[PDB]
XYZ file of C-alpha atoms in Angstrom:
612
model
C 44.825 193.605 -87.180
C 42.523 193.136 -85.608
C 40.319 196.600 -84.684
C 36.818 196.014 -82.336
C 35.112 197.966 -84.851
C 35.202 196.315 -88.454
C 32.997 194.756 -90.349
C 33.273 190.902 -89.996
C 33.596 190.293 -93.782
C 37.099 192.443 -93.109
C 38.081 190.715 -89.797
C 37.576 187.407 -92.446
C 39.694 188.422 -95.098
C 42.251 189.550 -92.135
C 42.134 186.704 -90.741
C 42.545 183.966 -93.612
C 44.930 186.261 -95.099
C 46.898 186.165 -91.293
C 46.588 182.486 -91.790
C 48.034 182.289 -95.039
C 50.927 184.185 -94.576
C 51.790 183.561 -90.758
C 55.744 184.726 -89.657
C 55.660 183.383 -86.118
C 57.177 186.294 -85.513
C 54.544 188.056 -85.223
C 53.813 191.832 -83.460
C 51.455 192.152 -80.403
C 49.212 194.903 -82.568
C 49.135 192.450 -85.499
C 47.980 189.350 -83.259
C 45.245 191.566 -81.922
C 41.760 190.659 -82.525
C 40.303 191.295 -78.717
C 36.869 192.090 -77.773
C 36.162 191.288 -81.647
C 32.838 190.270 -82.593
C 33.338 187.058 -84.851
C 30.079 185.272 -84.204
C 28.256 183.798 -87.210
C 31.711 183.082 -88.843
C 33.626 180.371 -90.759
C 36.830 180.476 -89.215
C 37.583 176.617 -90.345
C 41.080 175.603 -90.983
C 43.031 178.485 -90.366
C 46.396 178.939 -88.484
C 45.356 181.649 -85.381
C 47.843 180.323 -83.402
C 49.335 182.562 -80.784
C 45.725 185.356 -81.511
C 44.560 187.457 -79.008
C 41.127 186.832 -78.856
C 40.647 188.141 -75.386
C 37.481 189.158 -74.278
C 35.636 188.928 -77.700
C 32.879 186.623 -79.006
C 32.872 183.547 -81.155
C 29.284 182.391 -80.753
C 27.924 180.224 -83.799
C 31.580 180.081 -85.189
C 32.941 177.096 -87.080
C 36.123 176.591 -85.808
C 36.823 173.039 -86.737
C 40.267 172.109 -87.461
C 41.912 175.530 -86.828
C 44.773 175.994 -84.818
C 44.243 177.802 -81.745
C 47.604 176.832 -80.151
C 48.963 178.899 -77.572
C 45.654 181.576 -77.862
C 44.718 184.008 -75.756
C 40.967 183.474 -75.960
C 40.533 184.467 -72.484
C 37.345 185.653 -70.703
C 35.957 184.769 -74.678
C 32.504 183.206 -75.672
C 31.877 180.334 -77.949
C 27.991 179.546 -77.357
C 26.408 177.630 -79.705
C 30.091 177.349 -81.601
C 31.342 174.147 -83.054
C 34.895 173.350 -82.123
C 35.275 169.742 -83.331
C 39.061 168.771 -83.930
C 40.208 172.632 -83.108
C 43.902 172.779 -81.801
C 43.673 174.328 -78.335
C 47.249 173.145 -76.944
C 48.759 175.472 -74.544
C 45.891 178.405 -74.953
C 44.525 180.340 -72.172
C 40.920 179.657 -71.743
C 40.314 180.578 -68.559
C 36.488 181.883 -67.471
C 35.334 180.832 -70.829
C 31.986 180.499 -71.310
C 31.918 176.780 -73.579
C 28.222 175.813 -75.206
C 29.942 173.853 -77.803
C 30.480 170.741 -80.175
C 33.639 169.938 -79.091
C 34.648 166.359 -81.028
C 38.116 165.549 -80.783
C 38.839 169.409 -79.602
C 42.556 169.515 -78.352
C 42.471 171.421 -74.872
C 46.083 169.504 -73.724
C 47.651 171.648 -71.375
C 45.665 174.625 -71.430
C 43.758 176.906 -69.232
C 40.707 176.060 -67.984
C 40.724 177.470 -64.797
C 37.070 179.023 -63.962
C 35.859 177.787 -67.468
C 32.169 176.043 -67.973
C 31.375 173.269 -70.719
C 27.841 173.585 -69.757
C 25.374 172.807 -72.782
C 28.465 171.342 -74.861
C 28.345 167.811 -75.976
C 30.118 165.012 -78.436
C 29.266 162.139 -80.078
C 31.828 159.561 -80.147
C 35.422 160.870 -79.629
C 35.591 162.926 -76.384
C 37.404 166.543 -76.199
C 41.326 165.497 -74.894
C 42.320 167.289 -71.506
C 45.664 165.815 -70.773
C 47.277 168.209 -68.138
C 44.591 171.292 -68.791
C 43.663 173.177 -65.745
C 40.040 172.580 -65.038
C 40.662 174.338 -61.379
C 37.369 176.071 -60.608
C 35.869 174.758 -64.233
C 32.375 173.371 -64.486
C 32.643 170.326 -66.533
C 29.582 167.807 -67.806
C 28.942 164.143 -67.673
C 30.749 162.304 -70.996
C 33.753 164.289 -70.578
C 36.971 162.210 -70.311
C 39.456 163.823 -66.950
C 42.450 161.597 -68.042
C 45.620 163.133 -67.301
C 43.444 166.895 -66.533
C 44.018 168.990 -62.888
C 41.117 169.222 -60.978
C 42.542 171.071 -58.338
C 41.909 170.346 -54.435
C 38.550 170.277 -52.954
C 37.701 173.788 -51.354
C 33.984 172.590 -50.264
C 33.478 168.631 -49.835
C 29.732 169.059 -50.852
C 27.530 170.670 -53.103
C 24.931 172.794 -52.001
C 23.403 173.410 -55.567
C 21.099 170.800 -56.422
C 22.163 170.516 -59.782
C 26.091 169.986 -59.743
C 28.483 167.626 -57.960
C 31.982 168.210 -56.718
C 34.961 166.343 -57.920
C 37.908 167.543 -56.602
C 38.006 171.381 -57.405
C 36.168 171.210 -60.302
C 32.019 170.821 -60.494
C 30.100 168.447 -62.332
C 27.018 170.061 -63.880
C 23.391 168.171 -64.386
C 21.457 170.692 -65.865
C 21.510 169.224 -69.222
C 20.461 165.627 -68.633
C 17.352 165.345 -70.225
C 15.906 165.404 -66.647
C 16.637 161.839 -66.579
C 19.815 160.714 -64.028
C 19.780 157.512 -66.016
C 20.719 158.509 -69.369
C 24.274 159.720 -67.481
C 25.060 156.006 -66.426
C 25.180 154.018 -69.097
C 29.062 153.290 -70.478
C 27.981 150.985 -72.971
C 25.704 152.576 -75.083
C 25.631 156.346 -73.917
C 29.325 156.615 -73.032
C 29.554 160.276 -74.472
C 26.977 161.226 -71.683
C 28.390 159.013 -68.916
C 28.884 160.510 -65.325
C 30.453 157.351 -64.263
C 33.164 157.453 -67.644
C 34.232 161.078 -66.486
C 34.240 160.140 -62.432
C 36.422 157.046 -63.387
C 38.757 158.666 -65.854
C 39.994 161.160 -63.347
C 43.218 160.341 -62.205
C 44.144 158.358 -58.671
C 45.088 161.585 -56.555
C 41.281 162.607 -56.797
C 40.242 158.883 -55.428
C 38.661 160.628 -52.367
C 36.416 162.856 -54.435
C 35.455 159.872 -56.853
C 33.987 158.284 -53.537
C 32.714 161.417 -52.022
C 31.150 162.041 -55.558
C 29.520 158.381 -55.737
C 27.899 159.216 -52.446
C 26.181 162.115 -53.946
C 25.196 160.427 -57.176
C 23.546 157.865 -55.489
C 21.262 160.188 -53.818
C 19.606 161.168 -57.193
C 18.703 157.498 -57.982
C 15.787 156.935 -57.343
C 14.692 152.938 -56.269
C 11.885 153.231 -58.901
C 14.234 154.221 -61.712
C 16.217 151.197 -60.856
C 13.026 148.751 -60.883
C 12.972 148.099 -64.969
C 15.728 145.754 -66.233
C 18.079 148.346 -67.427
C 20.607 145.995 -68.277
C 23.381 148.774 -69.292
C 22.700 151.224 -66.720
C 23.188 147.948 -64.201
C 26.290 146.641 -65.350
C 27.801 150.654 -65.646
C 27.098 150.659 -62.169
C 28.897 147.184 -61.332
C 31.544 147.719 -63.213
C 32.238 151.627 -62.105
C 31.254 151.080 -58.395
C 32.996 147.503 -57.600
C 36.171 148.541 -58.321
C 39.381 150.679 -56.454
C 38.360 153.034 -54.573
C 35.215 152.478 -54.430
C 35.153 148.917 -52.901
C 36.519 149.722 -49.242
C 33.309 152.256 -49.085
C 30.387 150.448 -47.420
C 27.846 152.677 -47.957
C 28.300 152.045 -52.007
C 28.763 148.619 -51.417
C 25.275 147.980 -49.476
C 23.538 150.499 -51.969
C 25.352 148.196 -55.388
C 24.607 144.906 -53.769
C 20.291 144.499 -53.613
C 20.669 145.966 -57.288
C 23.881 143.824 -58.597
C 21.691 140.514 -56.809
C 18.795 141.084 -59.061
C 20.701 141.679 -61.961
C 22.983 139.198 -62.013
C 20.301 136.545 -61.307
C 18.577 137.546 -64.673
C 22.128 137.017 -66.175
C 22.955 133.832 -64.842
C 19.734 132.195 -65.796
C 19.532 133.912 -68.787
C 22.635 132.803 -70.027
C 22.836 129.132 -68.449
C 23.695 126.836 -71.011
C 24.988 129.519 -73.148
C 28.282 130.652 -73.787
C 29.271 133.721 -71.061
C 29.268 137.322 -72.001
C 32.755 138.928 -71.655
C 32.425 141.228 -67.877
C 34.732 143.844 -67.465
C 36.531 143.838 -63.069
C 33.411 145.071 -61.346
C 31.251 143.067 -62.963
C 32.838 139.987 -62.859
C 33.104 140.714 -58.751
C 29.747 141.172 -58.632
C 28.572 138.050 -60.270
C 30.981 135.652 -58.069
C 29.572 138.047 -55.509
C 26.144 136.903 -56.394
C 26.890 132.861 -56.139
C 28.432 133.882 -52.749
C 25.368 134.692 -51.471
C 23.329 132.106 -53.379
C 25.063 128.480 -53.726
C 21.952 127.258 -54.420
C 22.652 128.640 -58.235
C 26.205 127.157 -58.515
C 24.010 124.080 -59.403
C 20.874 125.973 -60.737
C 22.601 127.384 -63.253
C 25.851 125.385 -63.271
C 27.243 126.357 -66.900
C 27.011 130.394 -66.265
C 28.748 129.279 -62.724
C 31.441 127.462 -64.084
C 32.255 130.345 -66.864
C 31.956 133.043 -63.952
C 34.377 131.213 -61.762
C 36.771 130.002 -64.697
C 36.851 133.679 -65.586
C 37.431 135.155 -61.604
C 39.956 132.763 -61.109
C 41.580 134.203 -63.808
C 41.073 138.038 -62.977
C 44.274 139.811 -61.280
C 42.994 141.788 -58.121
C 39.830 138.873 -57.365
C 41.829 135.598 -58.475
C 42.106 133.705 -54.725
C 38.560 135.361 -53.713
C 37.039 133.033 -56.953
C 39.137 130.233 -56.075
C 37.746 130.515 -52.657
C 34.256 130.313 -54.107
C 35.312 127.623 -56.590
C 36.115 125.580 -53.853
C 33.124 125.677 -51.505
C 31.345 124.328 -54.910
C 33.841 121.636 -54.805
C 32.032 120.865 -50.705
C 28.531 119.709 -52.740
C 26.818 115.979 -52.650
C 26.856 116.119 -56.512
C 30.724 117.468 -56.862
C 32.368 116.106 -54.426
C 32.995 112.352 -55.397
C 34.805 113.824 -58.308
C 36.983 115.509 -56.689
C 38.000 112.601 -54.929
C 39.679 110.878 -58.185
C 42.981 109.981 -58.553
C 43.021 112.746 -61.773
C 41.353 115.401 -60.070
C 43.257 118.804 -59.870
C 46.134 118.518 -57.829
C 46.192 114.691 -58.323
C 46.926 114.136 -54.642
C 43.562 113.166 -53.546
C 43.393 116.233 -51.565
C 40.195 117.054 -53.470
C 42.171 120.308 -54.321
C 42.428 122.208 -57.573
C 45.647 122.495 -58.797
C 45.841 126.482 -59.397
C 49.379 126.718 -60.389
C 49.596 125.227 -63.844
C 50.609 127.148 -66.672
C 49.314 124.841 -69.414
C 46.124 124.715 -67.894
C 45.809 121.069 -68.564
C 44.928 120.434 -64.880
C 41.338 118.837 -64.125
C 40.074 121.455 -62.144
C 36.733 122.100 -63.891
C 33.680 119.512 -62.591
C 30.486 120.164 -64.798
C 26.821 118.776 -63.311
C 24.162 116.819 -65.434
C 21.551 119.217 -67.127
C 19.182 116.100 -66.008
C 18.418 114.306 -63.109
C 21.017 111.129 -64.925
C 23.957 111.952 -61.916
C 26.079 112.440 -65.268
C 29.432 114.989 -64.500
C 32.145 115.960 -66.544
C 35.705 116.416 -65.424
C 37.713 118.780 -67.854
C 40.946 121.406 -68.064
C 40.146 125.043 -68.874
C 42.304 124.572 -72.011
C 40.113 121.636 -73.432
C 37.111 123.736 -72.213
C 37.626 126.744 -74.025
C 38.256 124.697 -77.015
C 35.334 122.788 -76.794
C 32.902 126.234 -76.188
C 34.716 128.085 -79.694
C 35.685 124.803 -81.621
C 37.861 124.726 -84.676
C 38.488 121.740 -87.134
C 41.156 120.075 -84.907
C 38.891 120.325 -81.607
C 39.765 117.101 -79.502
C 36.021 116.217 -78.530
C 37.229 113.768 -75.902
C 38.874 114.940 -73.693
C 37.240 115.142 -70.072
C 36.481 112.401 -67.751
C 32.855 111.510 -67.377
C 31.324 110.397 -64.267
C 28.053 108.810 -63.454
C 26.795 108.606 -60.268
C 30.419 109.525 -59.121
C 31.777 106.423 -60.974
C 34.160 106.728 -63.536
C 32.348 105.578 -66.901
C 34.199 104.631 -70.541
C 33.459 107.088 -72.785
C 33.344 104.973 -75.609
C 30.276 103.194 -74.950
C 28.773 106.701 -75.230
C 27.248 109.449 -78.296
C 29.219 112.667 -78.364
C 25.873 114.193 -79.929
C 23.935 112.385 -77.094
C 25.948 112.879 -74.268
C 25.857 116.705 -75.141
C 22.153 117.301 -76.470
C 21.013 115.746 -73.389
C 23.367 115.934 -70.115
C 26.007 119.060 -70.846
C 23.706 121.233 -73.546
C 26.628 124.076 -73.262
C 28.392 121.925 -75.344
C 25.960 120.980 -77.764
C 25.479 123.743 -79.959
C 29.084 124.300 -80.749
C 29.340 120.427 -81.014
C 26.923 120.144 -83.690
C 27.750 123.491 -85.318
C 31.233 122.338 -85.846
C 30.411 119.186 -87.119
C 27.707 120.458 -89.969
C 30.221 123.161 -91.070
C 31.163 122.685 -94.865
C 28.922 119.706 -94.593
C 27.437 120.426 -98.566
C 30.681 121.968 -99.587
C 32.466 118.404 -98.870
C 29.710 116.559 -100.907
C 30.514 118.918 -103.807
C 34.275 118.057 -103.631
C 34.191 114.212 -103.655
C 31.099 114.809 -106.055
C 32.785 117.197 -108.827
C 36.417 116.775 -109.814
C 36.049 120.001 -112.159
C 37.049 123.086 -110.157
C 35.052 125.340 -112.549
C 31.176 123.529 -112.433
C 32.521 122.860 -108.371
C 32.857 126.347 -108.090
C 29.086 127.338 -109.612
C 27.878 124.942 -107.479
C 29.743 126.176 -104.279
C 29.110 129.627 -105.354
C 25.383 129.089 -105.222
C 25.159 128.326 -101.750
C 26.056 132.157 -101.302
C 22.489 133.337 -102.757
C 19.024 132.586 -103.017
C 18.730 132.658 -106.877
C 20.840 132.073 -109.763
C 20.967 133.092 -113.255
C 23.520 130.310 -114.454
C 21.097 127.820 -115.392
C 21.652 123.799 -116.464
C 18.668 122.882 -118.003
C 20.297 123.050 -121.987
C 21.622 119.812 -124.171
C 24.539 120.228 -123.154
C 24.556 121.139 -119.571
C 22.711 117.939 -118.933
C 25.347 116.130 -120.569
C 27.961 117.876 -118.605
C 25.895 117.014 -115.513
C 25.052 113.090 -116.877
C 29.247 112.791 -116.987
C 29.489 114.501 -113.270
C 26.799 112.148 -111.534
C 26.397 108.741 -113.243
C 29.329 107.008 -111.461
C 26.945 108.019 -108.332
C 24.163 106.679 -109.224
C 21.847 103.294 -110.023
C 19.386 104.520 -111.869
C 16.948 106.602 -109.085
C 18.909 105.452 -106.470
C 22.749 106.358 -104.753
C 25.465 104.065 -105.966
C 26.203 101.546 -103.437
C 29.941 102.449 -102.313
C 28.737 106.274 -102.633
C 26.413 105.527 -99.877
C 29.420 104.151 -98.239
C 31.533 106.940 -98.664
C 28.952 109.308 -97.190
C 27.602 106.973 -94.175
C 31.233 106.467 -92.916
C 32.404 110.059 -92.334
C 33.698 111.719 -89.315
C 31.060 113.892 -89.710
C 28.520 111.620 -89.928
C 29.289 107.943 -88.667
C 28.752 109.064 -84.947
C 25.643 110.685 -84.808
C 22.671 108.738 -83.863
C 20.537 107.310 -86.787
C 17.411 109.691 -86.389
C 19.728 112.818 -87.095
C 21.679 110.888 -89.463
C 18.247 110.569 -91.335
C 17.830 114.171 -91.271
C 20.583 115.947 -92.338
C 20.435 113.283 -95.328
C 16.988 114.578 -95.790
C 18.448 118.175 -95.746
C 21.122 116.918 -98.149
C 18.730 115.813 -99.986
C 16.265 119.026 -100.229
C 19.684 120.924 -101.085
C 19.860 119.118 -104.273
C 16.305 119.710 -105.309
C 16.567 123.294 -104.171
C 19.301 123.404 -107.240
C 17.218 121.921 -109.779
C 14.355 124.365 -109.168
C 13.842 127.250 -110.934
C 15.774 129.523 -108.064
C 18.998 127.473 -108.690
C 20.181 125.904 -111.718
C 16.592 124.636 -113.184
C 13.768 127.260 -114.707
C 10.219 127.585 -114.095
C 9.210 124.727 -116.482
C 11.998 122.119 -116.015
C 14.198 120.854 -114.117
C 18.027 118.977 -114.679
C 17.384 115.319 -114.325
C 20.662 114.184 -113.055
C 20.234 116.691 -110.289
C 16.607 114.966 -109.654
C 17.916 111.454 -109.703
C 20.518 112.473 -106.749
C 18.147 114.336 -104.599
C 15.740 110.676 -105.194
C 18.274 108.558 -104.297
C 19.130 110.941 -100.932
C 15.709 110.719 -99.861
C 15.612 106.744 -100.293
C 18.816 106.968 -98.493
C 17.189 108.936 -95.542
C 14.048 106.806 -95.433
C 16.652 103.634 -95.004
C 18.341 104.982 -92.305
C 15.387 106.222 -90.178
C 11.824 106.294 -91.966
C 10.186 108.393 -88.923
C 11.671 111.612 -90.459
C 9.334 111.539 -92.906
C 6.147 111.150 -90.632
C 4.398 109.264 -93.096
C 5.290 106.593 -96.059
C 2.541 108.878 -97.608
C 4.762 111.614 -97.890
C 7.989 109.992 -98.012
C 6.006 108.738 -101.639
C 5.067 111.703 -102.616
C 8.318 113.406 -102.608
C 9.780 110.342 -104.983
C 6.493 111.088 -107.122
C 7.401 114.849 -107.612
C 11.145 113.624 -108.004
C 10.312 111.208 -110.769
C 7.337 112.718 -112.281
C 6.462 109.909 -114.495
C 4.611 110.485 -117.911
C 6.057 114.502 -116.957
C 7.999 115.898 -120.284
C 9.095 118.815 -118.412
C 9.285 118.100 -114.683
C 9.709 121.595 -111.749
C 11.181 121.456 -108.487
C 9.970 124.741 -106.831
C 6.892 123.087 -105.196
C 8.545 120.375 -103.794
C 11.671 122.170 -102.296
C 9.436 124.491 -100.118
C 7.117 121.465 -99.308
C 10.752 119.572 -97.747
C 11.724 122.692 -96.018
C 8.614 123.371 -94.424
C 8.267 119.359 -93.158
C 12.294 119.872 -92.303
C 11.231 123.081 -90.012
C 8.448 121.653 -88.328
C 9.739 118.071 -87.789
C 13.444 118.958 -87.073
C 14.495 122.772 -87.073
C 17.634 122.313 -85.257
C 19.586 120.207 -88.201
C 17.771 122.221 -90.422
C 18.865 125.128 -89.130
C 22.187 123.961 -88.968
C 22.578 121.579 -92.710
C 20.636 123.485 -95.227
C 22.172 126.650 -96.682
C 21.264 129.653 -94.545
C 21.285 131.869 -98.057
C 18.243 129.511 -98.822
C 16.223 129.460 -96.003
């Protein structure tokens, strides 16, 4: 169509012409475009399928989104070409030279025999391979080998410094950055990862993925793997400590002084912390790790008991973490709680009971952050609730031991019990708790959906321009809060309401002090002139309820305040006697900053993130 001598402006107009009226049907001199030169082109979008671009040269072509389906591009060269999203299925691409982008590129069932990718790369969505014939191909870390034939091995090893055998194909590491560690990192370099294209090829090539490990490890150097390298490390664990590589004791004894040193960091890291999810090989090597160290089972007894809830849980390692679970059961501190008429089984066998589908068993015995000889005895069901808590969390259900005694937990503080003894729980404890905490003020404070909604709306941002300081949006405000209050202070049943909730009623009276505090620097942050007040004045309803807060707070637990100096000073600014015009601004920052030295924590948690 289609001569090797043309211009390329011709062989263009040829070819999106070609595209635009394609027969299928097509001649053998009409599909001809071989030996062509069609470098420097902008050949996107066009319908080529079934060309014969043998021999020729596509070099700095755009070729995204054509369809090259069922091509002869044979013996061709696309160096430096972009091929993202091209349609390749069921071309012949064999001895191919391949220096490409090749995103999302569509090589399914085609040749690829004798090919190189060497120099190509992507950046998120790998090139597809499914059932292409990579026999003889050199291919590149990144590259994803589901479903592609590799061919049988013809020599075990490689004698080239830079390349590594898999199967009959030939991984290339010329193109690295001269850095092995930027090719073993699935998490954050996956499109570069040596390990994602060993561990994508299929099962038949399971002898070359070990054979090929072998090899890898011999460009690691022990100084590359001193720094933390926290992705690179758990690529490693998770790629090597897995089918096939596990039966392979040369990988194992290389993994395990790295995987130990790691997963120490992890578990003491994360104690008292929810766990990070660990894909198989990870998870392995972390029950590995208490294996060889009990002594952390009880060092860092929260990341234990998530590893092992987790492992027991795992198909393929499930009776090697109950194994482990239960030599934790054998320790001075455990032990008498496993001897309970409720424990596991309930047989007094001091056994788990592994076989319950509800997962309502006792199986899970938690140690005492403190030297108290406190222990918790809980389900994995009521565990899991407890760690990502919802409004209808039951809080109460474990058994609680002391000294291996079983104790009423009713003479106990929820808040307490959990700051101090089992911290894992404490967080999501008091996290739950303060959720909605101002919202539900609001609600039982303003029957009118509209002014609730400003209010609630506010909580959202740091500034408003809806402002309340006018006539009549005092009197609006005056008809809101005067069934609430005595003059400065909180109506007496209102206290009542707000001392007797759920949310409230059961923590102990210092924090109860605080988060009134907090309540009561949210309602003078929306008098000021960020909120609902200006830069000269302030509502006075809004005043009067963030006064009678504050004498609230100072009832329930002066020593929030530090001082009856300041605690005076903050009714002084509140009241602002012989003031006309009265502004809030001062005094909100001068509560937050006493509420984030003297109590962060509640702060943190009760006062409006937006605002802080």
């Amino acid at each position: 169509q289609g001569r090797a001598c043309l211009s390329k402006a011709e062989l263009t107009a040829d070819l999106i012409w070609l595209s635009a009226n394609r027969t299928g049907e097509e001649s053998a001199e009409e599909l001809n475009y071989s030996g062509c030169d069609l470098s420097g082109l902008s050949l996107v979008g066009l319908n080529l399928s079934s060309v014969n671009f043998s021999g020729a040269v596509l070099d700095d072509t755009d070729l995204r989104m054509s369809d090259l389906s069922q091509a002869v591009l044979e013996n061709c060269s696309f160096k430096n070409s972009i091929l993202n999203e091209c349609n390749f299925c069921y071309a012949n691409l064999s001895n191919c030279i391949i220096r490409a982008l090749f995103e999302n590129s569509n090589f399914s069932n085609s040749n690829l025999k004798n090919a190189s990718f060497k120099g190509s790369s992507y950046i998120q969505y790998p090139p597809i391979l499914n059932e292409a014939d990579l026999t003889g191909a050199i291919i590149i870390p990144g590259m994803v080998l589901s479903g592609a034939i590799l061919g049988d091995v013809k020599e075990l090893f490689s004698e080239k410094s830079n390349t590594i055998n898999l199967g009959g194909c030939y991984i290339d590491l010329s193109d690295i950055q001269e850095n092995i560690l930027s090719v073993l990192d699935n998490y954050t370099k996956s499109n570069k990862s040596i390990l994602l294209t060993m561990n994508t090829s299929d099962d038949k090539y399971n002898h070359d993925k070990v054979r090929a490990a072998e090899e890898l490890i011999k460009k690691i150097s022990l100084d590359e793997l001193a720094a933390f390298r926290p992705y690179v490390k758990m690529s490693l664990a998770d790629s090597f400590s897995i089918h096939p590589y596990l039966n392979n004791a040369n990988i194992q004894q290389w993994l395990e002084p790295i995987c130990d040193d790691f997963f120490d960091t992890i578990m003491s890291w994360f104690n008292n912390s929810i766990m990070m999810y660990m894909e198989n090989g990870s998870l392995l090597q972390a029950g590995m790790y208490f294996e060889r160290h009990p002594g952390a089972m009880v060092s860092y007894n929260s990341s234990f008991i998530q590893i092992v809830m987790n492992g027991s849980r795992r198909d393929g390692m499930q009776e090697r973490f109950r194994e482990l679970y239960e030599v934790y059961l054998k320790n001075e501190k455990v032990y008498p709680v496993t001897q309970q008429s409720d424990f596991g089984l309930c047989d007094g066998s001091g056994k788990p009971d592994w076989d319950d589908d509800s997962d309502l068993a006792y199986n899970w015995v938690l140690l005492s952050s403190q030297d108290d000889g406190m222990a918790m005895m809980c389900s994995l069901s009521h565990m899991v609730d407890m760690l990502s808590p919802n409004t209808s969390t039951n809080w109460m259900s474990f058994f609680l031991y002391k000294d291996g005694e079983v104790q009423n937990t009713f003479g106990y503080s929820l808040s307490n019990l959990f700051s101090e003894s089992f911290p894992i729980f404490s967080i999501p404890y008091h996290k739950a708790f303060s959720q909605n905490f101002v919202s539900g003020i609001l609600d039982i404070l303003i029957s009118d959906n509209e002014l609730k909604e400003r209010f609630i709306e506010a909580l959202n941002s740091n500034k408003s321009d809806y402002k309340m300081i006018a006539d009549d949006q005092q009197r609006k405000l005056a008809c809101v809060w005067n069934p609430f209050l005595d003059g400065w202070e909180l109506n007496a049943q209102h206290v009542d309401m707000i001392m007797g909730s759920h949310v409230l009623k059961d923590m102990p009276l210092r924090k109860q002090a605080e988060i009134l505090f907090c309540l009561g620097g949210v309602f003078c942050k929306y008098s000021s002139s960020d909120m609902f007040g200006t830069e000269y004045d302030s509502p006075e309803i809004l005043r009067r309820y963030a006064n009678g807060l504050i004498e609230q707070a100072y009832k329930t637990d002066p020593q929030v305040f530090g001082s009856v100096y300041y605690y005076n000073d903050i009714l002084d600014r509140l009241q602002g006697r012989n003031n006309v015009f009265t502004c809030t601004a001062v005094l909100t920052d001068m509560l937050t900053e006493h509420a984030k030295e003297s109590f962060p924590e509640i702060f943190s948690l009760y006062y409006p993130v937006a605002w802080r």
